[PDB]
Amino acid sequence: LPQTVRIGTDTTYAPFSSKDAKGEFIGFDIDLGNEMCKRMQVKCTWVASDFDALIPSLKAKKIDAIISSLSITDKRQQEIAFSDKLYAADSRLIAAKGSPIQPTLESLKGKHVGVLQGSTAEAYANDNWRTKGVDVVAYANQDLIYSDLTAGRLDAALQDEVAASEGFLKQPAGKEYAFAGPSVKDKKYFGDGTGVGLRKDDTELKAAFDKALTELRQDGTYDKMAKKYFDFNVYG
């Protein structure tokens, strides 16, 4: 294991990863990463990046791990490895309160829909909606999506359900917004939970993260840290 593990994250996805008023990284991903590093007896350096630059940075050895609500998908397992599941993640649309929008091609006719570049939401929306004439706009970060949604430039946005609820719907900017239909189920695109992204050959590092994650779940640390942000079973 390296003496210092470099962990990449995109800090625009509260409650998982974001910045506080002093610029410190905060959220459930940060708490999990720091606790796992403590148990692994390694020092940790957090590195902020746009989400779509995380896998390229990991492959180029600029970072050693990704903790950034990274969904475990078949496509990504062909290029990188993952730790065991950190928590569940499903994608769901948001739109103005009272909107008739549903996550269907018919409902989205003539709508402007924002997605994060590099995300499972972008991959799903581009293949199923953009090809079929929905104006799917990809963004460098999720904060730009929420801002364009509030400016009226977007009609809807697709992202992880827990991030939209806690990071936007339950925040001042999101009071005028709500979920638009149910979460989207699609095995191929959305994967099964999130994990620490790692290079495929870093077998010792994966085993260390997996061991620390099991240990923090066994002793109840996982649930106690989760309580700060969630009143439900985020693990799934």
Ligand X SMILES: NC(=[NH2+])NCCC[C@H](N)C(=O)O
**Partner from ligand X, Cl ion, none binding residue 25, C-beta < 5-8 Å depending on class:** Cl ion
| The binder of ligand X chosen from 30, 36, 89, 101 (CB under 6 A) | 89
How many whole angstroms separate alpha carbon 223 and alpha carbon 235? Answer: 9
Structure tokens at 80: 């990188």
Of 134, 115, 135, 112, give the one whose Cα is nearest residue 123. Answer: 115
With CB under 6 A as the contact rule, the residue among 99, 120, 128, 165 that binds ligand X is: 120
Q: Shortest gap between Cβ of 69 and ligand X (angstroms)?
A: 4
Task: Please select the residue that binds Cl ion; options are 25, 189, 209, 222, rule is CB under 5 A.
Answer: 25
By CB under 6 A, tell whether 57 contacts ligand X.
no
| CA–CA distance, 214 with 202 (Å, rounded to integer) | 19
Q: Segment contacting Cl ion (CB under 5 A): 18-26, 70-78, 150-158, 223-231?
A: 18-26
Pinpoint the alpha helices (H) of 151-202. 161-164, 187-190
CB 82 within 8 A of CB 202: no
Q: Sort strands 156-160 and 112-116 into parallel, antiparallel or unpaired.
A: parallel
Which of the listed partners (Cl ion, ligand X, none) does 128 bind, with a CB threshold of 5 to 8 Å by partner kind? none
Indicate which single residue of 119, 136, 202, 206 sits in contact with ligand X (rule: CB under 6 A): 119
Q: How far apart are CA 191 and CA 89, in angstroms?
A: 8
Q: Cβ distance 82 to 197 under 8 Å?
A: yes
* CB neighbours of residue 61 within 10 Å: 10
222 is an interface residue for Cl ion by CB under 5 A: no
Of residues 74 and 219, the one with the C-beta less far from ligand X: 74
Reduced to 3 states, what is the DSSP secondary structure of residue 76? helix
How many residues lie near ligand X (CB under 6 A)? Answer: 17
Q: Which C-beta is closer to ligand X: that of 148 or that of 215?
A: 148
Positions that interact with Cl ion (CB under 5 A): 24-25
Query: Interface with ligand X by CB under 6 A: which residues?
Result: 10, 12-13, 16-17, 51, 68-71, 89, 116, 119-120, 142, 160, 194
